[PDB]
């Protein structure tokens, strides 16, 4: 009877549908958002920076590998 459920690092709640593995954790596909505007990537692409998510523009606005 070992555990068997991911937990959204956003609300620390047991996820149960589509999980997002980021920050070396798991996030509700609905709570995984940019770390600057909070825009969830339900079905979009996200960007990571310093260990934090960022939209395509905020990530870049924040850095953009440049």
């Amino acid at each position: 009877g070992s555990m068997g459920v991911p937990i959204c690092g956003a609300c620390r709640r047991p996820i149960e549908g589509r999980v997002v593995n980021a920050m070396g954790k798991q996030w509700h596909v609905e709570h995984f958002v940019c770390a600057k505007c909070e825009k969830p990537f339900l079905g979009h692409r996200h960007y990571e920076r310093k260990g934090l998510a960022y939209c395509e523009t905020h990530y870049n606005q924040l850095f953009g590998d440049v």
């Binding site: 937990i7 609300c11 620390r12 709640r13």
Partner: protein
């Protein structure tokens, strides 16, 4: 006067905190999160249902009750 079912939390590890504002608790402790300031570290003012209070890494416990309950 402050223990409504909002964010109850079950410990995941028997942590040890013995200071003025530190929370020492054995695993399996229902802690009533009194407050969750940022301050800087990330600790929370959580009372222990065992009837005690102290700061504790909000990552050493999980949350069961929640406010935003949509559907």
């Amino acid at each position: 006067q402050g223990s409504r079912v909002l964010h109850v939390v079950q410990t995941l590890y028997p942590f040890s905190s013995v200071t003025e504002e530190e929370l020492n608790f054995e695993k399996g402790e229902t802690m009533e999160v009194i407050e969750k300031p940022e301050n800087d570290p990330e600790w929370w003012k959580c009372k222990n249902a065992r009837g005690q209070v102290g700061l504790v890494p909000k990552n050493y416990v999980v949350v069961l009750s929640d406010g935003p309950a949509l559907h």
